[model samples]
Target chain A: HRKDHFIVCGHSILAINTILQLNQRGQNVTVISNLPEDDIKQLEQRLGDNADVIPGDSNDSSVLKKAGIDRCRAILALSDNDADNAFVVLSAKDMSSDVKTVLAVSDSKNLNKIKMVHPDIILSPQLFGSEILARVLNGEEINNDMLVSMLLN
Target chain B: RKDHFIVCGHSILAINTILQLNQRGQNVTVISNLPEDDIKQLEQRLGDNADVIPGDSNDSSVLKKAGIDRCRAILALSDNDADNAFVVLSAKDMSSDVKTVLAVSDSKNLNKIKMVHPDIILSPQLFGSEILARVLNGEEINNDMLVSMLLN
Candidate 1:
């Protein structure tokens, strides 16, 4: 089976922003959120018909399977709650052992716990946001690759 | 008297900003709502180089006591969005010339907050995520490109 779709879980600003970027790039994407139907409808309209917005708990394997988790190339767990995102990653992995997983973690304190689940990518908004803002305010240029190299290593 | 730096809230971001500024030989005053013991600990750690004031940043009187009018720059880094906005409003009202930087966790309120105070610097979660996402995707990241992506 060809896995060409990307799965994004959660309804956070980070998730929505990332989904928008992926959609703009014309990537096949599906958004799974626990948000109300009204909000999901609004998101669907904004994301266009190419993107699928499934309103359900991302932590559930059934929801992940419904969103085509088994056929997804990558899965992004961007929920506000670290635990929820972790669960989404676990569910995605259970559905497809080879699926790439990216998680958005807001608190640095949960780094070790989230790392235990073994996500391919871990993005921390608080850490990145603070560092970026500090650099911008200090009149320093931001080098994305350099920052990523430093972070990953 | 020379203007000093004012940091509002008791978050890791606030602590990091204060430390960075202090390392560069800048004077800083911290205004936070933490209990007296925590405030005392921060004061002791910062020593004579920084002043730690214990109070709610949303209170105008608290900001006044923190010397907002005489501060060169004020960073509102409270984890709460409403509190950060209040601090920005209070600081701007107290001192028009004071540079205000606000840390916001959500991008949905960025426009509303920026519109309310045009001079205030707004840093949202999307800005950081966009940079990180591009880096993860193995793409060249430019500041202007990231900013444009965030704005659009």
Candidate 2:
């Protein structure tokens, strides 16, 4: 897969975790968040310099664009605030149609509504928890290997 | 140590999704049985950082060679939900260290797949459905900020 750039809007723990995962890979990543300078600096130290931090509110179009959201290939709205992430996606879509949007939702109930927006990617920790819970209750087979074979073959 | 993201699937959409993630600086490795030209354009753009493993991700050997065991995230994005599920199960069996992210196309199989206990599961349908709602909201506002909006 090829992408022009990756953008992380907001500074939630989940968003930061995502950034840390990518930064450890030596990829050029950037973060746009409202975290204070001291916190941001600490985050940089922990995650390494692969991440470029842009501190500000994601709702502000100028703030987001200044963080290089316009040039990103993927824009992830992982902030704790669902509305902020949604705004980031909306702003990102308005700025670049080619940019892919990945959003995180805490409220599983609102998932359907969020999907209606046409975000390229949507994930919820709660949903993941549901799957885990289901697996624990019932024994079943998912067969990822077979799916890999079918697609690759 | 550099972290890496790997996707094993044939869906152009899945590959593209991961590509979007790659653009965000995540080192990405793609494994599939598709021909070279299938992902030529993406490969060209990604250069050496992104890779397309032209083999079966189901085979333990194929996955091993693709460095599946070492990846931070193994995205079983194959078109078939069951197949992707198998990869996640198998990978989990091989090593508990790696995180498994399965992409499920069929909503019906959601409960069944959950039985396998994937570390993380992603639903394209759910994803699509959620985005649709936001699009229709027509607030031209970011739906994610609702949390703060409510608090404020």
Candidate 3:
């Protein structure tokens, strides 16, 4: 049976927030990271036992396998470091071509390089942040559907 | 008379926020800890519409000197989580009525920061990434062809 769980790599703010959002939506999630023990424990507490935390290098294929990357429906590579995110995206794609991959790009300069791997979605926090601030200041309501369409399209 | 808008930090978020405020004919001042050289560059880019004050935003005196008492709103867009929280605290303490909006990149500290309840708290990564994920997962689309049609 095809698993409906999602795999999230890295322990960055984006990663943690994404997991929380997914969990809130009643979706199963597994976090793969090399963060400290304390950080993992804190994440475990926040995510509860419904989400699994695999403490290992997300760039390693073995660790990805341990997280069940092959059966995962989607994987988010959200490391703060651009290079690490690229590596995770590469490994995830290699393991499962059908799995939808999303990469969080910290720097806009790295967009072209990360785009080479062709992630389903490449998000730039700074860009989105600026746009959100601008819209809010203009007295517009915070609408995700409008914001996403404005940014992606 | 209404005081000018105050923007904290020299981040991209701050720059964009300052520009939008200025474009709307609102007088704006920026408070940042960036080096004098970088501050000069920002001032030059912002033209004569904005003022730049170089100091630690976490300092109460700095907020006072920036006219926090008279300002209508204070935006803490600093990259550091602790610094942003400190700025919010200082702003709220300085002016009970002034609007405070904080830009937080880290979601882990979101709860701690929200304890202060600065009029508005904007976390781009959390909102942006979640929306992107939802859209990619086949969430409802709103006029997808609009953006592509505009660009091409």
Candidate 4:
């Protein structure tokens, strides 16, 4: 069932890592990004037979079609670009009402604006990247509560 | 006090590490090579308590200058994988007693970093992705699973 796949927006390290992890879990993924020609070819090489890589505006409806967002089980918007992340989620929601929408945002200033659009889950890099790293270094144990702390929504 | 945290890299991750430690009343120092305007904001965030050293993290002399031999733990939370790995190697080479924590960006170099044997290897974003997938599947993460995920 290739139709039962997940779609990811962007070609960021976060996006690529997540897509690779999904592939490891036996999930199908289609990555949509507007990367350079050389970068796209490189990405395709890295994700060969794992996920589909298409180059285009990540937030546009026409670009989503290339990834089959309508049939996708879920979509992750994880680019560091706050503007792109917000719109990509919004576009995904509009196209696939039932699809699981995940948003990883960088700026706190855009949270209120992002909330109005309403994705299924919103994650902030602030807590996960530096904060979590510090706590682990501080001798704090990573448990169930710690895993649950990654969610912002 | 000899019991203090040493953070490498001038990125936000390093800043927040020092910031969190400082907020909890723990003494912390920073070692950074790049002179970023964003990194300059560290002094504004921590003021006089922010002990920042200007040098490359992989340099042995820089590690000594930062008191790695007597420090509690040294966390290399950089955007680059090889740099972080080298920092860990430098720390372990310089002092056997100091705890080393590394934050990884690229998942590809994970095994390369493992050879150095840091006390903890963190990739919160990548791990967060896996955590999200599990939560979506209705799995309750336990301490055992979490412990296994880290390099420690």
Candidate 5:
């Protein structure tokens, strides 16, 4: 029901899909990123005017502020660089304590440092890789420990 | 680039993965519905080294916020297969530009989902079945890697 939501990404494809999904659900969404203007225009054409794109470097705080971090209920920091995503999450946290922060983690190795900032959500490629590996090894219903061990190793 | 990564559905796994990632200078983020424990453990273990978020991966908002879009790859390791499938689909949908992988408990369901998304698919049933089939027979075959690469 909240109309305020922000999707900050390094690319346009993910943001496009997310905005499409949200639009289908009748949710208003904004795209804040450093993607090229042509890419943003393409997205706008695909998504129509319901989606808003603010082109800028998400790494810059001023850019984020201009995108309205304080009013947004959530910040989706989907970037290729794990460190950059973490930085965006930390910045979003500082800008708006109420805004939920979700970051994409390229690897699990940085979990210790990533967890310190307490973002609202984190996605790891390795964890996903291992879970799939475990499914290939243990049959359908696996114990939690088995999955954990797969990822841990 | 580092080859390994860790994540947990619960706090124990979340905290532990965070610790491991941070020790190596690799970046990490924890996503879970159980935000309280997962967040607490992530903070306790890594101390500003990791990012924590609480949400269902099945939700598009959740996945986007978790940065599924720009990720080079994504692993759908949630305990629930349906949830994993949804995560994989959302990732695939958002990531026409990135690689997506998913975990499934049921082999049949994995096949069905693969038909739709066809990202890297992993199933424990298939692996065990292959091993057992090999045990009974003399031929050794590996389908896991086949499936992993087949999707890409």
Candidate 6:
């Protein structure tokens, strides 16, 4: 019954892990995924009551609305599908500018495409994993400079 | 003899790290104990630029055999925090000149690992969970907020 929580769209490992982290931090979560029912069952045991899972294609606007995207604080698109993540970011932003939009890109090359939609923030394991090592190898310090460099530009 | 990398875990995180370095033509010595199947999998990913030092990283002797004294950097990518810390401590002791990068699984152990003073700390999970949590908690999306979520 609480408002201003999170609506996560994806059934990837990171999506489930993100929800787990959200619940631990005392934030309510609503999830939307199109995983097989068996996979959704595995998540059911782990999700908190405040967290709800609506299985559907996040690319559809109706699916995002059904997940209560308008009422949520933020919608995170981190499905394994790269283009799908970008589309959800587009879908969320088109629905409401008030709701923050976030996403993750598994492929570094697709970052430019995500940039076109202008997500509020972009997270990429490929970027972080690759660049962090590259910096340290060059004897660069891991300071604010490194952090700001990681932001999708 | 010098300017080599020592990766201290055999995870997908470590695999990506090795592959990244491999593309740059950097030589890496990975330290982990793997069964026959994992050995082949690792070997297959590595072209000619990597060697596997099969043993525990906590053993000072293992670090030595893996050339801790001469490598350019050591990355502690293990799932176990204590074990990762152990690698950093031993590597720093063996060669203060070697750069240290550590991967963290949980947020609680941040300070404990920080005391050892690794050169960098990485959390791939942040790409999913913590960023959402930070933004949801009303934090501004600025350089300062980005750094806090990413760095120690």
Scored by TM-score, the top model is 4
Docking class of 5: incorrect
lDDT per residue (tens digit) for residues A63-141 in model 2: 7677676666567788778777777878878877887787877555667777766777677654433332222222233
Regions more than 4 Å wrong, model 6: A130-149, B1-67, B76-123, B126-128, B139-152
TM-score of chain B of 5: 0.63
Cα lDDT tens digits, model 2, B1-152, are 23666777756445555555554556767887767786676567556666777777778888787776677667777768878888887788787787777766666787898887877666544443333233322223232332122111
For lDDT, candidate 2 versus 4, the one ahead is 4
The candidates' DockQ values read 0.41, 0.02, 0.30, 0.40, 0.03, 0.21
Q: What lDDT score belongs to each candidate, Candidate 1 first? A: 0.73, 0.62, 0.76, 0.76, 0.56, 0.75
Write out fnat for all predictions, comma-separated: 0.39, 0.00, 0.39, 0.46, 0.00, 0.32
lDDT by residue (tens digit), candidate 1, A1-153:
225777888877788778877766656678887878688788788766776787888878987877887777788888889999888878777877888898888676898899889888777766655555555555566665656653452
lDDT of 6 by residue, A33-137 (tens): 788889777777767565588877899999888778878888889788988998898888889877788788866668788899898878877556656565546
- What's the TM for model 4? 0.77
- Chain B TM for prediction 1: 0.76
Q: Write one digit per residue (lDDT tens) for candidate 4, span A84-125.
A: 888988787787688788887766557678877788887765
lDDT of 5 by residue, B27-52 (tens): 55556776576557646666755566
Model 6: per-residue Cα lDDT over B90-124, one tens digit each: 98887788878898755468778899888878767
TM-score of each model, in listed order: 0.77, 0.45, 0.72, 0.77, 0.44, 0.60
- TM-score attained by model 1: 0.77
Residue-wise C-alpha lDDT for candidate 4, range B43-145, written one tens digit per residue: 6776777687878888889888888888988988877888999999988777777888887766678778889999987776676667666665557888567
| Model 2 stretches with alpha carbons more than 4 Å out | A1-3, A143-153, B1-152
Residue A83, candidate 3: C-alpha displacement in angstroms: 0.7
> Can you rank all candidates by TM-score, best first?
4, 1, 3, 6, 2, 5
Give candidate 4's iRMS in Å, 1 decimal: 2.8
Candidate 3 lDDT by residue in tens digits, A1-153? 226788888887778878887877777888987988888888788777775898889889988887887888788888889998988888877887877788888776787798798787778777666655655555555554675655441
Q: Order the candidates by DockQ, highest first.
A: 1, 4, 3, 6, 5, 2
Clashing residue pairs in candidate 3 are none
